[PDB]
Amino acid sequence: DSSVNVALQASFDAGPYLLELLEAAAAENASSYFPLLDRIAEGVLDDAVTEKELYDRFLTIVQDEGHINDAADLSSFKFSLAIRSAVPRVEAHYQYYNTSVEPRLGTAACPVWVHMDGMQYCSPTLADLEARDLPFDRKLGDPTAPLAILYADVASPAFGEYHRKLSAMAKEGQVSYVVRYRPPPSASFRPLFLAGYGVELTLKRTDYIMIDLKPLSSSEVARLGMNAASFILDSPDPFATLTKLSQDFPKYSSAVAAYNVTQEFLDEYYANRAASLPGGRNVLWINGLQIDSRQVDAYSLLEHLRHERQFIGQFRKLGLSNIEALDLLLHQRYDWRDEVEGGDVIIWLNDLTKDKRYSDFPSDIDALLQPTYPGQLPAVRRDVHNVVIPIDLTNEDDVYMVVQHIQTFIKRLIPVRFGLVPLVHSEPAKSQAKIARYLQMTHGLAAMMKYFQRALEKDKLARPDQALFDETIASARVLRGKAQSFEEALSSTTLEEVMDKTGRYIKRLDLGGRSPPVLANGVLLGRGDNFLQELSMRVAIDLQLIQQSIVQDAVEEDTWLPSYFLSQAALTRNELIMPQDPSKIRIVNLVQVAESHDLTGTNSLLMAVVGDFDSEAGLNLLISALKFRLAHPEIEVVPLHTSDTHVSSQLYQLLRTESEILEKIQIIKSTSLAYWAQTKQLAADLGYPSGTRGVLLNGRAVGPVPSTSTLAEDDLEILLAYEFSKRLGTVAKVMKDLNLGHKVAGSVEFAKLTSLVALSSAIKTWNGAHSAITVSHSDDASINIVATIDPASERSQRWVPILRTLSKLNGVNVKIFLTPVRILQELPIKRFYRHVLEPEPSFDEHGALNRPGASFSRLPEDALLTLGMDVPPSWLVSPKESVHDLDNIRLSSLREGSDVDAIYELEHILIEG
């Protein structure tokens, strides 16, 4: 008889396997690129291009690189070729060149050439589409005004001597150089078979049902899962047992029914409720770090695996063991009321406790129950819900918001109270605000809108004309009017202290600029995003939290309910430093084996105040920073700056003869070598390019922004406190808590460690006695994969081969906890599975790369089986045509010795939009 085979092919076809080498090379350590290229220019792969000489003459080359000749980097790289994937970047260079370059070119005799500022030549002696920094590019030289874009197929000696001393230009320092590859004649491509997918053969009609010819089993099944583990655990070599067992579960089933489950059936069934607390599910960790079941894929794993080894690899800089380091790694509202200065900044359109729209319905709090959503809360005149909407009366969007439906909710008796702060963030936005304020203050409570109503609509609010002003003063319709001013409302009684009073409330709460958030019971709602239903929802959330309060353990009627929301621990400020709307936390370290290493009280945390001293926010940040160094003497600061004058020059001996003294020097300066060389540069690399500014705190970054004291002292240690946080403070208290005096004594090197932890979690895995198929060294595996694998899940079947492939990677521990199901209510794994995934591209040949595939020999006939595919979410794939129904496969009905050689196709993936 014979079998059933499956392979899978990419729609588009690969170029010379050689490129894929190069791009797989920098896939590991990326700096590898050009240096390889430097020497390969000398063509030590320039003899025959058959894949394995250039392959092995390649490996013997890259093992001349410390970048990729680590212990295991070089294994990761093996994997990446058995891993199909260096081609895609290669494919990019092509798709650009085929669509963006060769079309826009016209007419050729020259086969390789560069883009320089215009045209060029087929000779290396030295225009509507420009030299733009494309995604796949690699810059050689530092990136300035000049760019040299080399187009060439790197494979033939034909190219050879362009680069060699176009490798002589940045070298001296002239034009920035980047290499983009050429596509060959369309006849050069040879095909591309893939891996990292799985092949289903599910039992469509079978006797393998519950109550070689064709399996059976009954309701010894809740057991089937149980037992399946001991079964694996009692074989001499268990991991291998694991593998065959999963592969073809349904046929082995009626066997595994009569083999009861062993002693660490249950000392790990309650020992799962201490360590490793999943029961029967599949989760995966890489160094304790859970992976999600949607990236249990070969690709994902690979680039996670090595954006893990270096991060840790980054620790042996300080000289560490790390059987120690990763058991090292283990162990919302804002105040909205304008009170704080003044007491009538905010303009409240609504007032529950006073507006008569909200009639006379009682305030009984405990009568505040059972709502249908035609009515989220009964009508009760309590202060509960408060929404503060910051507005630019210059912004048209804003006004339309309020004039129609801020106005309607009120009107539709919604028990929510609304208010505005007028943004005073432009010469016109204030004036309107001025105007605005002046109406309810003199010409009372409706004129303003019924100004802004008519101002909004057919006039445009872009600027406030008084022509309109005087017309609505005449109106007092709904209104009326005491405290006259009229005219040009240029009063001093307004110009600043409703204005700075609005002015700082804003800047208190950080609401300047283009679009400021919304205050919904203290929680910020981005107005940029839709929010009106999130408003409607964050209320109905916030509602119950109060109902939760009152129903239970609560206060009586003599308490102000919004206190409840507002009573947290978090006061009154910024969305940048503490950016918990975009949870953008920039951590910046690691990478400082730069051209820096400049060296310049116990352990101490570390702050740099990087600035543009000599200017706006220059000293203003710096003085703010310094009154801060006093307030908090814990840390010594190292300021740095970026400009393009002899007035920051005592900055350069703040104390340099061997500070506080200085902290008054610059305030007496406020009204009146090559340090700089590195500062800005080595600033610009921490963000803070070219003048742009903020401060660092021991790995914590900020950035630059709009005004000059937005980064003030108050801000600095609301920064520190939840910078100190459960982040960088605690680092101190887990010390070498574990022991040694310190290998990280310094405050500079402590600064370093604090970064890495902030890059980060799933706290603990433990109890494996002899109830765990271990598959690696527990020691300084500079990778730890733990994973729990249910012997009888379907999900497990992908997982296992991957693990063998992963485990058979060098320096990649893999350990497996069988965690079967309590009581399998039905038959799990009703299919056959094997997985296409090798850890090195293999050969075994007449000389050419192996096309990865599957092979289904030894299957029960007489009954229908279905071939499906198992593969990443992003993959679209079709099966080519055949005499056989690939859904309907009954090996009986067939002819002997012949079989089914199926080949699916990766037709691109998924472009939608």
Numbering used by the authors: 29 to 135, 139 to 157, 166 to 250, 283 to 402, 415 to 683, 694 to 737, 742 to 755, 760 to 773, ...
Article, verbatim:
Remarkably, the quality control system is equipped with an elaborate backup mechanism employing a molecular ‘gatekeeper’ that can specifically catalyse reglucosylation against incompletely folded glycoproteins as potential substrates, thereby regenerating monoglucosylated glycoforms for their return to the chaperone-assisted folding process. This gatekeeper function is executed by a unique enzyme, UDP-glucose:glycoprotein glucosyltransferase (UGGT). Our results reveal that UGGT has a modular structure in which the 35-kDa catalytic domain is tethered to the 125-kDa folding-sensor region. The N-terminal folding-sensor region is composed of the four Trx-like domains and the β-domain assembled into the C-shaped structure with structural plasticity harbouring the central cavity displaying hydrophobic patches, which putatively accommodates incompletely folded glycoproteins.
We determined the crystal structure of the N-terminal folding-sensor region of UGGT (UGGTN, residues 29–1142) at a 3.1-Å resolution. The overall structure of UGGTN displayed a C-shaped structure containing a large central cavity with 60 × 80 × 120 Å dimensions. The N-terminal Trx1 domain showed a unique Trx-like fold in which the four-helix subdomain was not inserted between β3 and β4 but preceded the α1-helix. In contrast, Trx2 and Trx3 domains exhibited a typical Trx-like fold comprising a four- or three-stranded β-sheet surrounded by six α-helices, in which the four-helix subdomain was inserted between β3 and β4. In the present T. dupontii UGGTN structure, the α6-helix was ordered in the detergent-free condition. The Trx4 domain represented a typical Trx-like fold comprising a four-stranded β-sheet surrounded by six α-helices, which, however, exhibited an unusual topology. Namely, in the four-helix subdomain, one core α-helix and β-strand are encoded by the N-terminal segment (residues 275–410), while three core β-strands and α-helix are encoded by the C-terminal segment (residues 897–950). Such uncommon domain architecture was also observed in the β-rich domain comprising six-stranded β-strands, which are encoded by three discrete segments (residues 29–39, 231–244 and 959–1036). Although we hypothesised that UGGT possesses a β-strand-rich domain comprising residues 942–1149 based on the bioinformatic analysis, only the N-terminal subdomain comprising residues 959–1036 gave unambiguous electron density, suggesting motional freedom in this domain. In the central cavity of the UGGTN C-shaped structure, remarkable hydrophobic patches were found, suggesting their possible involvement in folding-sensor function.
